Amino acid sequence: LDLILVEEYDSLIEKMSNWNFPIFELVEKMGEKSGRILSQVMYTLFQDTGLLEIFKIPTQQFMNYFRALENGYRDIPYHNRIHATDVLHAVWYLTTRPVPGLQQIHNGRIAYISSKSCSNPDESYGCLSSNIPALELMALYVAAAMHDYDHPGRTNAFLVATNAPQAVLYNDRSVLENHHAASAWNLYLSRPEYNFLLHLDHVEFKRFRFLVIEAILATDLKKHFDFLAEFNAKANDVNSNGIEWSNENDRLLVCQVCIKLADINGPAKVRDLHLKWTEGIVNEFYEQGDEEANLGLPISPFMDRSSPQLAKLQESFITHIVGPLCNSYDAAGLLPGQWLEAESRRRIFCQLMHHLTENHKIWK
Amino acid sequence: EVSLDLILVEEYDSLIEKMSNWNFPIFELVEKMGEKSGRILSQVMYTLFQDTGLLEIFKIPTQQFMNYFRALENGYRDIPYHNRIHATDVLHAVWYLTTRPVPGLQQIHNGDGRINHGRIAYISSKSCSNPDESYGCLSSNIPALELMALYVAAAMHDYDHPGRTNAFLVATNAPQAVLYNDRSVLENHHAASAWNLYLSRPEYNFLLHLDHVEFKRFRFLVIEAILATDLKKHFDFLAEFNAKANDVNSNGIEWSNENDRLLVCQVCIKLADINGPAKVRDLHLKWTEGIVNEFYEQGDEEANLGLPISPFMDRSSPQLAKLQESFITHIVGPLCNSYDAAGLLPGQWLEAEEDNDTESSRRRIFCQLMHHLTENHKIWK
Ligand SMILES: CC(C)Cn1c(=O)n(C)c(=O)c2nc[nH]c21
Ligand SMILES: CC(C)Cn1c(=O)n(C)c(=O)c2nc[nH]c21
Ligand SMILES: [Mg+2]
Ligand SMILES: [Mg+2]
Ligand SMILES: [Mg+2]
Ligand SMILES: [Mg+2]
């Protein structure tokens, strides 16, 4: 049994080491225990990261909370625990793997993580794990795991339009996003057997909670262009200055843009995966459409299964949302990739940047 | 009948006449009402909505209006400061500030039985009017729908206040602070609560004659006003306001810009929410009393919880003078100046449009609340 469990860990880490991690396959391998995918992946990553040790996190409470958090994810076509797991894997990968030419100032007193499943080929590379303190990256990983907690499979617009109690409760501002963060943090405080951050002083915990909220609320698309604008003003402005990883604010922004990219990574994966996710999103949209119909309301754009515009939807999405975000992130040179020759006065190859471009074509 | 209708009119004219003054004697009204004093807010709201014409503009049914505002009052807890009386005071302030004559204010704007949704309505106070063309009032630049939202927001900005600060709630990990992720915890609760109350029952629906567009906008405007009363964002609003209105490279206002209009409206409740040290000594002190008493009530609970008593909240070690001094210096002070610099403050010209004293925009103006502020400041230094 001991060896059997160790084999499973090495197996997973090997699978997850690919940006195009076959998450749907894992779902199958787990079979009936499929519902514990988010907690299992969280455990595996917190180990590979070393966070469990860095913050003396008791294994029991950790699993208690995340096993609970998982059950909070409804059984809907897209915004479910599998999505959360995917978003988690993405932020982990994006802040762990080698980034061509990334200058690592804080190159690992504040603790810094380092994935045991990869390392920079040489000084020509770098990674966020070396510029962003472990506390902050843990907030990101946790935020990712709870960012779509208890999603109803409906959009903020729908909630706001139908004057849903949840929308009235939050004054129509980031309705879902607020509810995700609040519901999850509430769950955490519900029982003492969930408190896995007990070994953090009131100071650290206060900040950790802040960071987690900031990350989750940044996943509200209505604020997409504001983050993007703000991120570029700091990172991609020849009259500005790089980032200054020694700055909390700058670092936070980097983290927010990172989770934003991870939440909508769909079209930046291999076609196989991209289509599987797309199928989920639209099926969920069509359900929302059938309701608007039943409520005698105008069906929202791209949500009418009788008059679909799947390609127009995806083409539009990539063009206006994921695309510009990816470029900004790429321009800041934070995207993991690899050099092409033996010489940023050199050609790099960004696998996800490539996937995005190819996918855009299938929707044109 | 007539002997009953003629008496109802008298009360109206009285209240209006009394409110027609920046230093409206609220507490005197509280007593004049005595046992029916629990309905100050609903009575003032109704009165002000007639003085402005809002009842007619949006064909607001009296029954549902009273129904809702009566219920809204009841939501205000019986605490030392954040109570229906404070609400009524703030409501009166925004009403006054956006209605009385303002020296040199541009009038750039629109100066039967069916509602014409094609035309943008503007309200006009019956209890006053611009002395001459040298004066302009805010109600002439900000559409009725927007001012009505400001007034309604004032009436609900502190709904169900617990008498505790946001910091307190965040620190004690109150269920409400968790719910709103420590962001404008109280302010969020006020708006969400009042709105939930409004949609609670059909007999509260007094806005039943606004089309979906108008309602949607009204709701948005109200929330924006209420949430601006969170002092944590005080300096941010002040900064932004200065950037537009009066700064080195300031632009102006352009009342045609919805955003600028909202900013002005927000800076208004902002001021009206803390008008205390800008009223006459009498009123200023009476308010100061309520605030400290409440601050102390908090300090007590902080103690019963084994928490460090928050600054100025320890009654067995008060620092009232220091408190007010600082507040009038770092908060209300800079706000009034900024608002004054933009020239949006009611007031009156000192001299004739001939101030070229060779024997020594250009003429002199006297702002009542501007001086009250300088005076009250003295009695704390
Ligand atoms: C689900 C939706 C709010 C955002 N979103 C997304 O994240 N991915 C990956 C898509 O392909 C997509 N297509 C439309 N909307 C989309
Ligand atoms: C009540 C408090 C949050 C703000 N506040 C206020 O509104 N007025 C009028 C004061 O004099 C005052 N003094 C300290 N804090 C104050
Ligand atoms: Mg989401
Ligand atoms: Mg998501
Ligand atoms: Mg308040
Ligand atoms: Mg108030």
If you write DSSP's letter for every residue of A259-275 in order, what string do you get?
HHHHHT-GGGS-HHHHH
Ligand 1 pocket: which of A276, A317, A325, A355 to mutate (most atoms within 8 A of CB): A317
Q: Chain A contacts of B199, Cβ < 8 Å? A: 163, 168
Assigned token pair, B265: 């409206």
Cα gap B44→B18, rounded to integer Å: 11
d(CA A361, CA B342): 54
Instruction: Point out the residue among A171, A181, A186 whose CB comes nearest to the CB of B192.
Output: A171
Tokens linked to B37: 């004093």
A348, containing H or E segment: strand A348-349
Q: Which ligand is nearest to the CA of B294?
A: 2
Query: What residue numbers of B does the annotated binding site for Mg(2+) cover?
Result: 86, 157-158, 273
Q: B273: CA distance to ligand 6 center in Å?
A: 5
3-class secondary structure, B230: coil
Q: Measuring CA to CA, which residue among B165, B154, B29 is closest to residue B97?
A: B154
Look at residue A338 and give its three-state secondary structure: strand
What is the experimental resolution, given in Å to one decimal place?
2.9
Helices B2-19 and B84-97: crossing angle in degrees, nearest 10, is 80
Query: How many domains, chain B?
Result: 1
User: Tokens standing for A35?
Assistant: 């519902």
Please give the Cα distance from B343 to B164 (Å, whole number): 35
Residue nearest to atom 4 of ligand 2 (CA): B274
Which ligand has the shortest distance to the CA of A217?
3
Q: Which of residues 82-121 of A touch B (CB under 8 A)?
A: none
d(CA A355, CA A357): 5
DSSP H or E stretch at residue A349: strand A348-349
Calpha distance A83→A215 (Å, rounded)? 16
- DSSP per residue over A15-30, as a string? HHTSTT--HHHHHHHH
Sign of the CA dihedral running A34, A36, A42, A46: negative
CA-based nearest distance A44→chain B, Å: 29
Q: Pick from A139, A118, A136, A135: which is nearest to A127 by CA? A: A118
- Spell out the SS3 assignment of B184-208: CHHHHHHHHHHHHHHHHCHHHCCCC
- Alpha-carbon distances, residue A165 vs A154, B67, B193, B342, B375 (angstroms): 13, 22, 11, 40, 48
Residue B373 burial by Cβ neighbours in a 10 Å radius (0-12, 13-18, 19+): buried
Query: How many CB atoms sit inside 10 A of residue B291's CB?
Result: 19
Counting other chains too, the contacts that A292-296 makes at CB distance below 8 Å and 24 or more residues apart are A292/A158, A295/A162
Q: Which of B259, B228, B242, B229 is closest to B339 using CA atoms?
A: B242
Q: What determination technique applies here?
A: X-ray
Q: How far apart are CA A191 and CA A64, in angstroms?
A: 10
DSSP letters for A162-195: TT-HHHHHTTTSSHHHHHHHHHHHHHHHH-TTT-
| Ligand 2 binding pocket mutation candidate from B327, B331, B377 (most atoms within 8 A of CB) | B327
Q: Are B284 and B376 in contact (CB under 8 A)?
A: yes
Tell me the C-alpha distance between B270 and B196, whole Å. Answer: 23
Which of A165, A178, A189 minimises the CB distance to B181?
A178
Q: Within 13 A of B17's CA, how many CA atoms are on the CB side?
A: 6
Rounded to the nearest angstrom, the minimum Cα separation between A20 and chain B is 34
CA distances from B54 to B97, B152, B207 (A): 17, 11, 11
Structure tokens given for A137: 């990256």
- What residues of A are annotated to the active site? 79
Contact status, residue A327 vs residue A352, Cβ threshold 8 Å: no
Question: In angstroms, how far is CA B325 from the centroid of its own chain?
Answer: 22
DSSP secondary structure, B318-373, as one string: --HHHHHHHHHHHTHHHHHHHHHHTT-S--EESS-S----TT---S-EE-HHHHHH
Could you tell me which chain A residue has the CA closest to the CA of B192?
A169
Contact yes or no for A172 and B227 at CB 8 A: no
Distance between CA atoms of residues B265 and B233, nearest Å: 15
Rounded to whole angstroms, the Cα distance separating A224 from A215 reads 13
A73/A38 Cα distance (integer angstroms): 10
Which of B175, B182, B223 is closest, CB to CB, to A171?
B223
Cβ–Cβ contact A43 with B under 8 A: no
DSSP B91-113: HHHHHHHTTS-EET----S----
Q: Cβ atoms within 10 A of the Cβ of B315, count?
A: 14
Amino acid at B120: I
Start-end of H helices in B2-39: 2-19, 26-33
Q: How far apart are the first and last CA of chain B?
A: 57
3-state SS, residue A339: strand
Closest CA to B83 of B92, B71, B95, B75: B75
Q: What is the DSSP letter of A320?
A: I
Nearest CA to ligand 1 atom 5: A264
Ligand that lies nearest to the alpha carbon of residue A216, given by its number in the listed order: 3
| A263 CA → ligand 4 middle, Å | 5
Instruction: Return the ligand number nearest the Cα of A83.
Output: 4
The Cα–Cα gap between B194 and B41 comes to 14
Contact (Cβ atoms closer than 8 angstroms) between residue A136 and residue A255: yes
Is A142 in CB contact (< 8 Å) with chain B? no
Is residue A196 packed enough to be buried (19+ CB in 10 Å), middle (13-18) or exposed (0-12)?
buried
**What amino acid occupies position B188?**
N
Paired tokens of A186: 């509430």
- The reply to whether residue B173 touches residue A189, judged by beta carbons under 8 angstroms, is yes
Q: Cβ contacts of residue B95 below 8 Å, gap of 6+?
A: B19, B48, B51, B52, B151, B154
Q: What is the CATH number of the domain that holds B234?
A: 1.10.1300.10
Nearest to A168 among B175, B183, B195 (CB): B195
Query: What's chain B's length in residues?
Result: 381
Separation in Å, CA of B28 to nearest CA in chain A: 36
Q: Are B302 and B313 within 8 A, CB to CB?
A: yes
Whether the CA torsion B357, B363, B368, B372 is positive or negative: it is negative
| A203 vs B: CB within 8 A | no
DSSP label of B252 = -
Which DSSP string corresponds to A197-239? TTTS-HHHHHHHHHHHHHHHHTT-GGGHHHHHHHHHHHHS-TT
For residues A257 and A224, the answer to whether their CB atoms sit within 8 Å is: no
- Please choose, from the candidates A59, A191, A51, A213, the residue with its C-alpha nearest in 3D space to the C-alpha of residue A143: A213
Q: How far is B158 from chain A (nearest CA, A)?
A: 15
> Do strands B365-366 and B348-349 pair parallel, antiparallel, or not at all (unpaired)?
antiparallel
Q: Is the minimum distance from the CB of A87 to ligand 1 under 6 angstroms?
A: no
* DSSP character string of B104-165: T----S----S--TTS------TT---SSTTEE-GGGTS-HHHHHHHHHHHHHTTTT--S--
Cβ of A317 below 6 Å from ligand 1: yes
Which of A171, A194, A220 is most worth mutating to test chain B (most B CB atoms within 10 A of its CB)? A171
The token pair that represents A116 in the structure block: 């045991």
In the reported structure, the alpha carbon of residue B87 is separated from the centroid of ligand 2 by a whole-number distance in angstroms of: 14
Residue B169 CA to residue A303 CA, distance in Å, equals: 41
* Sequential DSSP letters for B270-325: HHHHT-GGGS-HHHHHHHHHHHHHHHHHHHHHHHHTT-PPPTT--TTS--HHHHHH
CB B179 to CB A182 under 8 A?
yes
- What's the domain range around B252? 1-381
Q: Is B352 on the interface with A (CB under 8 A)?
A: no
- Say if ligand 1 is within 6 A of residue A313 CB: yes
* Residues with C-beta less than 6 Å from any ligand 2 atom: B 81, 274, 276-277, 287-288, 291, 323-324, 327
Residue A328 identity (one-letter amino acid): S
Neighbouring CB atoms inside 10 A of A347's CB total 11
Inform me whether the C-beta atom of residue A297 falls under 8 Å from chain B C-beta atoms: no
- CA distance linking residue A29 with residue A105, whole number of Å: 41
Q: Give A338's strand partners.
A: A349
